[PDB]
Amino acid sequence: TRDFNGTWEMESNENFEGWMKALDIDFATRKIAVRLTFTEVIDQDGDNFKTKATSTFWNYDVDFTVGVEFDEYTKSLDNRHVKALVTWEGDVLVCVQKGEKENRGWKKWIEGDKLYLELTCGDQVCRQVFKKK
Numbered sequence: 001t002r003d004f005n006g007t008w009e010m011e012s013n014e015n016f017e018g019w020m021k022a023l024d025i026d027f028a029t030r031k032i033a034v035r036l037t038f039t040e041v042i043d044q045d046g047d048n049f050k051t052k053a054t055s056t057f058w059n060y061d062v063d064f065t066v067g068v069e070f071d072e073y074t075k076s077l078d079n080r081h082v083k084a085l086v087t088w089e090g091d092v093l094v095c096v097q098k099g100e101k102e103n104r105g106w107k108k109w110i111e112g113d114k115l116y117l118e119l120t121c122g123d124q125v126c127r128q129v130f131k132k133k
């Protein structure tokens with residue numbers, strides 16, 4: 001399936017700490033963030049995605065069109081300029097963010113009724129799993 005529409009509730013989060021540290025997120029922010037449950041709301045219409053991550057203390061929204069490069073400034077994360085591109089590899093949605101950090105980006109897919117997210121930066125991978133609400 002290629003349909004990521006829905007409200008998705010975090011049920012599993014692995015190495016969130018390592019990933020944030022690879023992005024040079026400040027220690028105090030990491031200390032709180034690694035504790036928190038996140039919810040991801042995805043609105044998808046063909047290539048057009050609008051996504052919104054929420055937690056008690058932090059939000060992170062990003063909209064994109066699959067196949068269309070977009071310059072990104074990651075304000076509420078690590079405050080860097082990257083060139084971002086989201087494309088399909090089969091049923092896996094793949095984002096590459098070209099910039100200072102190598103191997104930076106993510107992958108999303110569905111297996112069964114669950115959303116899987118792999119976040120990458122440098123040699124660090126964070127893996128998250130969400131259940132559909």
Ligand SMILES: *C/C=C(\C)c1ccc(-c2ccc(N(C)C)cc2)s1
Nearest residue numbers: 033053058060062076077106108117
């Ligand atoms: C497709 C999934 C994306 C773009 C994201 C999932 C989680 C994100 C995130 C986690 C933590 C923070 N802070 C600043 C604590 C920001 C964003 S993005």
